[PDB]
Design a protein around this ligand. Sequence first.
Ligand SMILES: CC(=O)N[C@H]1[C@H](O[C@H]2[C@@H](O)[C@H](O)[C@@H](CO)O[C@H]2O)O[C@H](CO)[C@@H](O)[C@@H]1O
Ligand code: NI
Length: 176
Amino acid sequence: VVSFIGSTENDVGPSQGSYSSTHAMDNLPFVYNTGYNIGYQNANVWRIGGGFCVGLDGKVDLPVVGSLDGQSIYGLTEEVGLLIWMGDTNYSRGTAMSGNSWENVFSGWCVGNYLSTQGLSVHVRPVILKRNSSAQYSVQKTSIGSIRMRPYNGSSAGSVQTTVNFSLNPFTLNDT
Ligand SMILES: CC(=O)N[C@H]1[C@H](O[C@H]2[C@@H](O)[C@H](O)[C@@H](CO)O[C@H]2O)O[C@H](CO)[C@@H](O)[C@@H]1O
Ligand code: NI
């Protein structure tokens, strides 16, 4: 079966992270490719065992202000939005998020007759929407959304906690 073993509120990105870019923000919107640097990752959010089957759904609560290659650009301020990925523990397995409804972000797996864990990951990349004369862009603490576990194939959470939340740590972007 399954148990919750992670934290309910989770911060994405390092407190007061500084993200600079040498590319020219020539055409907007401009994506800051900060890789997986602005993220949260935890291999052990639920413990599971004995044929248990679980995937992950994700939801972004930020307003959609556009899209980039079919993925929603979620707005933070008039100047800065975000591309968002949520999914299984590995950052590389992140699912690009669109819209504001619950979306399947990890197809899932079944644990055999052993005990193991289900984890998750969230990462984002800043997007320059509107220019700033200072060439510096600031964002304060902000709620992003949530991820929940999805028991399937008979399995069920029961009264176990299903959902965790994510907050963006404030950061500053330097247009270098
Ligand atoms: C890696 C970890 O600590 N937990 C993973 C989990 O991994 C399992 C199993 O799937 C994997 O085959 C073996 C290594 O060969 O390790 C076990 O512990 O896999 C799930 C789904 O990918 C992750 O959510 C979890 O973080
Ligand atoms: Ni380039």
